[PDB]
Design a protein around this ligand. Structure first.
Ligand SMILES: CCCCCCCCCCCCCCCCCC(=O)OC[C@H](CO[C@@H]1O[C@H](CO[C@H]2O[C@H](CO)[C@H](O)[C@H](O)[C@H]2O)[C@H](O)[C@H](O)[C@H]1O)OC(=O)CCCCCCCCCCCCCCCCC
Ligand code: CLA
Ligand code: CLA
Ligand code: CLA
Ligand SMILES: CC(C)=CCC/C(C)=C/CC/C(C)=C/CC/C(C)=C/CC/C(C)=C/CC/C(C)=C/CC/C(C)=C/CC/C(C)=C/CC/C(C)=C/CC1=CC(=O)C(C)=C(C)C1=O
Ligand SMILES: CC(C)=CCC/C(C)=C/CC/C(C)=C/CC/C(C)=C/CC/C(C)=C/CC/C(C)=C/CC/C(C)=C/CC/C(C)=C/CC/C(C)=C/CC1=CC(=O)C(C)=C(C)C1=O
Ligand SMILES: CCCCCCCCCCCCCCCC(=O)OC[C@H](CO[C@@H]1O[C@H](CS(=O)(=O)O)[C@@H](O)[C@H](O)[C@H]1O)OC(=O)CCCCCCCCCCCCCCC
Ligand SMILES: CCCCCCCCCCCCCCCC(=O)OC[C@H](COP(=O)(O)OC[C@@H](O)CO)OC(=O)CCCCCCCCCCCCCCC
Ligand SMILES: CCCCCCCCCCCCCCCC(=O)OC[C@H](COP(=O)(O)OC[C@@H](O)CO)OC(=O)CCCCCCCCCCCCCCC
Ligand SMILES: CCCCCCCCCCCCCCCC(=O)OC[C@H](COP(=O)(O)OC[C@@H](O)CO)OC(=O)CCCCCCCCCCCCCCC
Ligand SMILES: CC1=C(/C=C/C(C)=C/C=C\C(C)=C\C=C\C=C(C)\C=C\C=C(C)\C=C\C2=C(C)CCCC2(C)C)C(C)(C)CCC1
Ligand code: OEX
Ligand SMILES: [Ca+2]
Ligand SMILES: [Cl-]
Ligand SMILES: [Cl-]
Ligand SMILES: [Cl-]
Ligand SMILES: [Fe+2]
Lengths: 34, 195, 38, 334, 37, 200, 137, 97, 243, 30, 34
């Protein structure tokens, strides 16, 4: 299909960037003192 | 306000009427393909999701009540000034955890979420309509059109819906938009076989 | 396709029998409070 | 305990991470079959001759669809209400061409969701809860029954069931408007009041409860930490909430009883959606929306259009264009 | 569940972060031409 | 239990009045939907054949027979959308039925005026109409005051059967809770879940 | 606009004679047409044969001519195909076939005149809508 | 070089008159006395090399012959177009109101 | 004697009548008598499609296919004149009947091949001097294959021949030339050929049965693509009558 | 590549369901 | 220039994935008790 050839990178960064932001925040939360 | 302001005139705003509003809906389908618009889709998710949360929360509270009276009708067994929760959060949480897999455990979160979902939905829909003011629609998938253009055996529900849209436009436009002085001869009207 | 048919029929019958006999197996008694409902 | 006794104890066990139960014994395999078939079809199913006119519609991703356009396509109009399990086909290729996945999926789904509802009762019973959460769930469930089973029955074909896809959903809606003028049907209007109202009261309730949370935290932390799971004391001040909302409108328009309030919260969307469902299910037998076409006439007899007639023109566009190759005769009678 | 005693904290100091980012960015700068080809 | 049973019976009655034309004679209740769609196909087969059409060999736009085609098991049936209704059976149509379905020679030679009349009548009394009883498709103009009895009875009984299913769930669940003694709520000092182990 | 005597003035015969219907006759005509005809002829079309409509010009070109009260009344007594060649009372409602089309049993000559008048007056009001079908709704 | 044959045919006499070889039968309703009897006979006995050949259809009455003669100025003939005459489309071309 | 209720949903309705093994007789032809086939039935059992040559340009073969449109394939209740020619050959001139079926078959790898399986306007003739129809009689002749879709058929973007848009409206400013083949619908009309091989004859009843093979083009989607070559094989039945 | 993306995102969502259910932070009564 | 149309997403993910891994590790290291 003649899709937009940037759709792949757009979707991939759309998922990855905020997901990564959240994982960073979660993981640095867990490692704080109990 | 914004929508008609982006269009030719107030004429294309919704008219304040039941049937008129329905007309507004069908216009948006035929002309904007508004169902295909992901902002509208988020609106839908927020509205139906809000109704879901409303129903499920009401029912959950009503079915995890503590017995605080002798009455079989349980409404009187509550006092506005009472300190205690009127229903069991713990039992509710276990119920949904075992039924659905996850459950609220925090009431403040639950209720903020109940605010968040429908408000956000409506806001997304507002953004989409802002797009439609400029006719900046999600009308088409270009890949779909290129494929269908080259391949007359290629059919999806998307293309079928565009046929529906085209019908709506041609059949309703002359009476719906009288200022255009549309005259559409019988022969130009799009129609399938028989109908 | 006959074998698939027979297999599905058997599976369905199996789970249905589990459902029915299961609810027949003193279900009213399976609650945290008053069990003597017979 | 013998093996059967032990099995019964496990099935109905309140300690399982996910409750199984006897409804669950039916629900699990049917929902798994339906899910697996749906996913596989959605990715890989070939085009389906939905309308029985040897005009196959592609629903799957690999055959040129994206997430919005994709669907599992309804079974052939040639099949109608005939039961079309895999084993009635001469081959899987035939089964696929004629839309067998649609029937397999929707039948397993409807069975499974009915069992989901029963399962909600069952667990409510096991936990010593009141039993009516499942009745609330009867609202969306009935609606699914309306679009996957009752409408097809009324029209005489599963080809008229709602497609399992986003754009296919829209197709179903537009065609439904064309054929029943659903917008002008009071049960659908009650449905709309139901979901708009449901959302309104959800946001409202959310906002008032959030508005009256008792200070238990500092500004540098989330207020959600002000509530601890399972605490006995209520986490907000309902008297203050009622004090606010009662002044926003007027005193007696506000709930001071949390139980009455939550009952209202349950009932409005559930009842409204029950009416939506009954709307679909009765338009299934072509008792359709209000028809005020040419209701207004001047002294000579000239037709004076109202908004209903413009609706009518749109509806006409829809009617004449849908399934452009399926009709040989002038009236669309089902 | 009874906790696992084999658990260890994990660390990456700032210098190691800077070194790592340098490695990744320079590798990217080198290979990118070949990815675009 | 009785509510459940009545719900079931309601749905059964709904399908009975919608499809059955024996204990619900079309003479009295009007044509079924299938009946009327088939009647349309019959009507135009008759019309066009009178005009000189060879209705057996007439190929429609799709490749399927315009008037006549095969069911998925090979039976000769009316074509177009009414393909879905080939299971329909009615006294006005059956004389045209042979071992293999609709018989082309009977169609060509044996259709009687009473059949044309009946097919036209049923076609134009199809069970379609608005809530204010404007007969026909949703886009039809005001003129005909008609909603088929089949529609009134099917719709009414679906609504009734559904609410009776709801009543069934309500009352079965309440009977269970009351029998077990918690229909009024959870005992604060004896909350069952509090005596259950945590899920995780 | 009003339903004037002029609108209600329609051809009685093929010889230039007219008849002016009363408002009550027009109403009776609408009522009786709905009662006996509209199931198939709603809006001036023909559901069981859309090739033939109730437009005045079409009636004018029918054989014998039907674009007048007399033609239509005779049709209601003894309907023919459009060319007059065969009598179709057996498949079309008429006084002659009131036995098989029972709604025609209580129709009087006056009723036939009223129906005919409805058929001729309606297009004078509705224009292309009469016999136009869904395109003009 | 691809051509829509129906559109192309509309530029011949087919687009101006009743084409005895191609036009769908309902067109005969346009003129007094032609439908359905003569219409049926005409379509059934098509194609015709010339318009006047319509007078040679067997079984005609003198009346029928005269009506046809009065209506010859409204008829034409062009080459049979497969697209217009297959499918029994001359009897029902999928057009109603 | 079977009724509709005996037959309905069994698949038998898509089957042609058979004659038992004892039916090896001869049906005399009186060359002074006129004859008709009152019922010709064709029940396909196999559809074969000629593979498109890779480019080796050797002999491309006909390969098997899977029927996906179910038991909707047979031609039946076909009738027509059976002429006795001056050289004693018989010529069947098809007049009418259910003489076509749309059929979709599926090739290895998934390609679907729609075709209008047909004998429309069949003209089939025997060898000369057939004084009796026997298990040695054969019919060979040709038929018409009209476009699988007729002229009103609309493609998914609303384009058609006798109806529809004449352009790619979703691409208002695309260059038209590259889309011409898709925009401009064409109506196919080609020839097919069929042989009927009589295997059984009931001299007393005038019934004959045997096997057939036909060759014809498949759907070309109103000129959008090249059609495939199809060979259909199956059994047939005909009842001959004096008329 | 589109299909791969769509199915990938879906699979990620299902896996997410799995973790969100079986590896959630447990609710604790204080 | 007629470059490989996947070069962009390849380079982007090549940079981003391990960089993110390291940022996660660093940040959860900093949040640990001193
Ligand atoms: C919070 C806010 C929530 C908002 C949502 C609320 C949901 C309900 C809203 C619906 C409001 C209805 C307005 C009334 C419209 C009207 O005036 O309605 C008009 C109609 C009659 O209309 C007339 O009906 C006629 C029908 O014509 C036909 O019949 C005529 C002769 O009768 C002629 O023969 C004519 O030729 C022929 O065409 C004509 O069309 C007229 O023009 C037309 O005006 O009233 C009827 O049909 C009467 C019978 C049906 C009425 C039933 C009402 C719906 C009930 C749903 C609620 C359920 C509650 C359950 C309680 C537990
Ligand atoms: C699943 C089905 C579905 C759902 C759930 C929705 C839901 C939504 N659609 Mg809809 N829609 C659908 C299908 C659906 N749509 C379809 C099939 C179409 C055809 C294409 C449309 C076409 C459509 C359009 C064209 C529009 C919507 C809108 C919206 C939103 C309306 C929000 C709202 O309540 O505004 C209601 C109004 C308000 C919230 C404004 C404030 C109202 C004040 C407070 C009222 C005060 C009243 C006062 C007290 C006096 C009352 C007096 C009394 C006598 C009446 C909402 C997100 C709208 C939207 O997207 O807007 C952004 C919109 O314009 N939809
Ligand atoms: C919960 C288990 C379950 C259930 C309920 C079903 C149910 C269904 N599946 Mg199956 N299916 C299952 C598991 C299950 N499936 C599994 C695990 C697989 C993978 C192997 C499949 C694979 C599968 C396939 C491949 C197909 C189905 C299909 C079918 C349907 C037809 C079955 C039938 O004809 O049975 C016949 C059996 C009976 C009538 C049972 C009678 C015997 C009992 C003892 C009498 C009492 C029953 C009576 C009706 C009343 C019910 C009792 C009630 C009052 C409590 C049906 C919707 C088909 C389909 O969906 O077609 C569209 C189909 O194609 N299923
Ligand atoms: C959605 C429909 C539904 C649901 C959720 C329930 C659920 C409930 N019913 Mg039931 N019930 C129903 C319909 C339903 N009913 C109907 C239609 C009838 C009339 C025949 C009854 C008659 C009934 C009685 C007489 C009783 C119950 C009971 C109850 C409750 C106790 C559970 C019970 O023992 O299961 C029984 C479940 C059923 C009788 C039907 C369940 C149907 C669902 C769809 C499961 C189908 C499973 C089946 C094996 C799959 C078929 C596969 C096929 C291919 C072969 C419970 C609240 C009992 C109760 O405690 O009441 C106070 C009780 O004694 N019900
Ligand atoms: C093979 C593959 C590719 C198949 C895929 C194809 C198929 C089409 C996939 C679908 C694609 C996709 C999902 C379509 C939807 C996309 C889009 C429309 C989403 C909208 C995006 C979103 C940002 C919109 C913004 C508006 C808003 C945020 C909407 C969010 C809606 C939200 C999820 C509503 C909540 C619904 C959910 C069920 C709530 C669960 C809560 C539940 C636990 C309550 C139980 C409960 C109640 C109590 O009262 C108490 C007390 C307790 C304790 C308790 O527990
Ligand atoms: C220039 C001019 C002259 C200026 C002069 C101004 C002068 C000072 C004015 C003074 C005189 C004045 C009074 C004359 C008035 C003029 C005129 C009447 C104005 C009318 C304006 C307007 C149109 C009136 C609309 C009527 C009204 C607003 C309709 C909406 C209200 C609606 C019907 C409420 C009923 C619904 C009800 C069920 C809601 C409950 C559901 C939901 C809220 C549950 C959530 C919830 C509820 C709780 O209860 C609590 C507790 C909690 C927790 C909670 O979750
Ligand atoms: C002119 C017409 C002729 C008449 C014909 C009659 C028609 C039938 C009318 C139907 C009767 C309804 C009875 C309601 C009783 C009830 O609910 O009691 C339960 C409680 C009792 O009230 C609570 O009552 C309690 C005391 S007690 O329980 O009553 O003893 C008290 O503690 C508490 O504060 C108080 O709120 O009611 C409430 O919780 C608040 C009212 C909520 C509204 C209920 C309706 C359901 C939602 C509407 C449906 C949606 C429709 C729109 C579609 C979107
Ligand atoms: C009496 C009429 C019943 C109408 C249908 C049911 C409506 C309410 C049920 C919704 C289910 C939601 C999920 C369960 C949530 C749930 O758990 O509710 C719990 C709530 C409280 O339970 P109780 O135990 O205190 O009372 C129920 C019995 O035990 C009797 O005491 O139950 C009720 O209030 C029933 C209300 C009957 C009276 C209400 C009538 C209101 C509807 C009137 C119809 C108007 C429609 C017109 C449209 C225009
Ligand atoms: C029979 C078994 C049925 C199993 C089916 C699987 C059900 C899966 C339920 C959702 C799992 C993921 C939840 C993540 C998030 C999560 O882990 O939830 C956990 C969360 C717990 O809330 P708590 O109160 O405990 O936490 C509050 C504090 O953390 C405040 O921060 O529950 C909610 O937030 C409910 C509201 C969101 C509910 C979202 C439901 C959406 C459903 C699916 C929508 C996407 C569809 C995509 C299709 C392609
Ligand atoms: C298919 C799925 C793929 C996802 C997986 C993600 C991939 C993750 C890859 C991890 C790599 C990160 C490297 C850690 C980098 C880092 O932490 O180094 C510093 C580190 C020191 O470790 P220490 O023993 O001192 O302990 C410190 C701890 O805090 C480390 O956690 O040494 C090593 O890691 C060994 C490798 C030396 C690397 C030195 C090379 C840097 C020099 C500059 C090179 C570029 C410029 C050249 C100019 C010509
Ligand atoms: C007259 C009629 C006739 C006959 C009738 C018949 C003979 C029928 C019958 C009888 C019968 C024979 C009926 C029925 C069925 C029964 C029921 C409906 C059952 C149910 C079941 C249940 C409900 C149970 C529940 C549950 C179980 C499941 C499990 C456990 C628990 C419990 C027990 C709860 C005919 C049709 C021929 C024709 C028409 C008319
Ligand atoms: O298939 Mn689906 O949509 Ca119920 O209407 Mn008739 O069919 Mn077809 O047209 Mn319109
Ligand atoms: Ca031989
Ligand atoms: Cl459609
Ligand atoms: Cl049809
Ligand atoms: Cl006309
Ligand atoms: Fe609440």
């Amino acid at each position: 299909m003649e899709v937009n050839q940037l759709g792949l990178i757009a979707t991939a960064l759309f998922v990855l960037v905020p997901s990564v932001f959240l994982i960073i925040l979660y993981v640095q939360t867990e490692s704080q003192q109990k | 306000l914004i929508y008609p302001l982006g269009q030719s005139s107030w004429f294309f705003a919704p008219s304040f009427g039941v049937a008129a509003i329905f007309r507004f809906l069908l216009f948006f389908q035929g002309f904007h393909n508004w169902t295909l618009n992901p902002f509208h889709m988020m609106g839908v998710a927020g509205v139906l999701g809000g109704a879901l949360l409303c129903a499920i929360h009401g029912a959950t509270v009503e079915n995890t009540l503590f017995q605080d009276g002798e009455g079989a009708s349980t409404f009187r067994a509550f006092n506005p000034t009472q300190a205690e929760e009127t229903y069991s959060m713990v039992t509710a949480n276990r119920f949904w955890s075992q039924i659905f897999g996850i459950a609220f455990s925090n009431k403040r979160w639950l209720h903020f979420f109940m605010l968040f979902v429908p408000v956000t939905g409506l806001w997304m829909s507002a953004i989409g309509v802002v797009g439609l003011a400029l006719n900046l629609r999600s009308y088409d998938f270009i890949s779909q059109e290129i494929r269908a253009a080259e391949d007359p055996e290629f059919e999806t529900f998307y293309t079928k819906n565009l046929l529906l849209n085209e019908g709506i436009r041609a059949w309703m436009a002359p009476q719906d938009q009288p200022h255009e002085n549309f005259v559409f001869p019988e022969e130009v009207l799009p129609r399938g076989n028989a109908l | 396709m006959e074998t698939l048919k027979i297999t599905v029929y058997i599976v369905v019958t199996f789970f249905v029998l589990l459902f029915v006999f299961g609810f027949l197996s003193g279900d009213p008694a399976r609650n945290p409070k008053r069990k003597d409902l017979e | 305990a013998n093996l059967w006794e032990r099995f019964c104890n496990w099935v109905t066990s309140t300690d399982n991470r996910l409750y199984v139960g006897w409804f669950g014994v039916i629900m699990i395999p049917t929902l798994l079959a339906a899910t697996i078939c749906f996913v596989i079809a959605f990715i890989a199913a070939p085009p389906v001759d939905i309308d029985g006119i040897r005009e196959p519609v592609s629903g799957s991703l690999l055959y040129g669809n994206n997430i919005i356009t994709g669907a599992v396509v309804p079974s052939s109009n040639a099949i109608g209400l005939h039961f079309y399990p895999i084993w009635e086909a001469a081959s899987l290729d035939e089964w696929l061409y004629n839309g067998g996945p649609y029937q397999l999926i929707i039948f397993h789904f409807l069975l499974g969701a009915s069992c989901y509802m029963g399962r909600q009762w069952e667990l409510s019973y096991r936990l010593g809860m009141r039993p009516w959460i499942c009745v609330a769930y009867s609202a969306p469930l009935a609606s699914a029954f309306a679009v996957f089973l009752i409408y097809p029955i009324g029209q005489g074909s599963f080809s008229d069931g709602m497609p399992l896809g986003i754009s296919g959903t829209f197709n179903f809606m537009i065609v439904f408007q064309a054929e029943h003028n659903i917008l002008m049907h009071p049960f659908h209007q009650l449905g709309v009041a139901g979901v708009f109202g449901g959302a309104l009261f959800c946001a409202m309730h959310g906002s008032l409860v959030t508005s009256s949370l008792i200070r238990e935290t500092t500004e540098t932390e989330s207020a959600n930490y002000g509530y601890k799971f399972g605490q006995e004391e209520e986490t907000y001040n309902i008297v203050a909430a009622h004090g606010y909302f009662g002044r926003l409108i007027f005193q007696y328009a506000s709930f001071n009883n949390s139980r009455s309030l939550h009952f209202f919260l349950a009932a409005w969307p559930v009842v409204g959606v029950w009416f939506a469902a009954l709307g679909i299910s009765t338009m299934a037998f072509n008792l359709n929306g209000f028809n005020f076409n040419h209701s207004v006439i001047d002294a000579k007899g000239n037709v004076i259009n109202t908004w209903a007639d413009i609706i009518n023109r749109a509806n006409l566009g829809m009617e004449v264009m849908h399934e452009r190759n399926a009709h040989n005769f002038p009236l669309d009678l089902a | 569940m009874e906790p696992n005693p084999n658990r260890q904290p994990v660390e990456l100091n700032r210098t190691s972060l800077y070194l790592g980012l340098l490695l990744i960015l320079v590798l990217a700068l080198l290979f990118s031409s070949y990815f675009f080809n | 239990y009785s509510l459940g049973a009545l719900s079931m019976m309601g749905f059964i009655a709904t399908c009975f009045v919608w499809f059955n034309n024996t204990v619900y004679p079309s003479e009295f209740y009007g044509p079924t939907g299938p009946e009327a769609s088939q009647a349309q196909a019959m009507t135009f087969l008759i019309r066009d054949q009178k005009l000189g059409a060879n209705v057996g060999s007439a190929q429609g736009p799709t490749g399927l027979g315009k008037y006549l085609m095969r069911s998925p098991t090979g039976e000769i049936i009316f074509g177009g959308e009414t393909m879905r209704f080939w299971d329909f059976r009615g006294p006005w149509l059956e004389p045209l039925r042979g071992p293999n379905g609709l018989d082309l020679n009977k169609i060509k030679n044996d259709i009687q005026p009473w059949q044309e009349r009946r097919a036209a009548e049923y076609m134009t009394h199809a069970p379609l109409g608005s809530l204010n009883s404007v007969g026909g498709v949703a886009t039809e103009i005001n003129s005909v005051n008609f909603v088929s009895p089949r529609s009134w009875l099917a719709t009414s009984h679906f609504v009734l059967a559904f609410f009776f299913l709801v009543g069934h769930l309500w009352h079965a669940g309440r009977a269970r809770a009351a029998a077990a003694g918690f229909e009024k709520g959870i005992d604060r000092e004896s909350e069952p879940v509090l005596s259950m182990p945590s899920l995780d | 606009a009003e339903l004037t005597p002029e609108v209600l003035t329609v051809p009685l015969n093929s010889e230039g004679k007219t008849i002016t219907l009363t408002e009550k006759q027009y109403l009776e005509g609408k009522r009786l047409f709905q009662y006996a005809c509209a199931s198939c002829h709603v809006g001036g079309i023909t559901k069981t044969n859309p090739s033939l409509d109730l437009r005045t010009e079409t009636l004018a070109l029918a054989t014998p001519p039907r674009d007048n009260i007399e033609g239509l009344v005779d049709y209601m007594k003894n309907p023919t195909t459009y060319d007059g060649e065969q009598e179709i009372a057996e498949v079309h409602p008429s006084l002659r076939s009131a036995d098989i089309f029972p709604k025609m049993r209580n129709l009087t000559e006056k009723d036939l005149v009223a129906i005919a008048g409805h058929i001729l007056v309606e297009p004078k009001i509705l224009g292309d809508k009469w016999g136009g079908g869904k395109v003009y709704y | 070089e691809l051509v829509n044959v129906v559109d192309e045919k509309l530029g011949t006499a087919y687009g101006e008159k009743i084409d005895l070889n191609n036009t769908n039968i309902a067109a005969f309703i346009q003129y007094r006395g032609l439908y359905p009897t003569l219409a049926k006979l005409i379509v059934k006995n098509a194609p015709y090399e010339s318009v006047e050949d319509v007078l040679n259809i067997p079984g005609l009455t003198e009346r029928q012959k005269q009506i046809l003669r009065e209506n010859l100025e409204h008829f034409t003939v062009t080459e049979v177009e497969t697209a217009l005459v297959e499918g029994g489309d001359r009897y029902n071309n999928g057009l109603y109101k | 004697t079977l009724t509709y209720d005996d037959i309905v949903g069994t698949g038998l309705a898509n089957k042609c009548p058979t004659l038992d093994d004892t039916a090896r007789g001869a049906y005399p032809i009186d060359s002074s008598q006129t004859y008709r086939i009152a019922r010709l039935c064709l029940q396909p059992t196999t559809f074969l499609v000629k593979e498109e040559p890779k480019n080796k340009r050797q002999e491309a073969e006909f390969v098997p296919t899977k029927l996906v449109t179910r038991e909707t394939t047979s031609l039946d209740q076909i009738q027509g004149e059976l002429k006795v020619n001056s050289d004693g050959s018989l010529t069947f001139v098809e007049e009418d009947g259910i003489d076509f079926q749309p059929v979709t078959v599926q090739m290895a790898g998934g390609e679907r091949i729609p075709l209008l399986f047909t004998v429309k306007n069949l003209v089939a003739s025997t060898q000369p001097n057939v004084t009796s129809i026997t298990t040695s009689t054969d019919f060979k002749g040709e038929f018409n294959v009209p476009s699988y879709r007729t002229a009103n058929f609309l493609d998914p973007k609303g384009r058609g021949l006798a109806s529809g848009y004449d352009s790619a409206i979703a691409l208002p400013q695309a260059k038209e030339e590259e889309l011409a083949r898709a925009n401009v619908k064409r109506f196919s009309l080609t020839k097919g050929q069929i042989s009927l091989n009589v295997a059984k004859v009931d001299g007393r009843t005038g019934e004959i049965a045997g096997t057939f093979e036909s060759e014809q083009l498949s759907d070309d989607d109103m000129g959008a693509h090249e059609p495939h070559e199809v060979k259909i094989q199956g059994v047939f039945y005909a009842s001959i009558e004096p008329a | 590549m589109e299909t791969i993306t769509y199915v990938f995102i879906f699979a990620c969502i299902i896996a997410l369901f799995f973790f969100a259910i079986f590896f959630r932070e447990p609710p604790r009564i204080t």
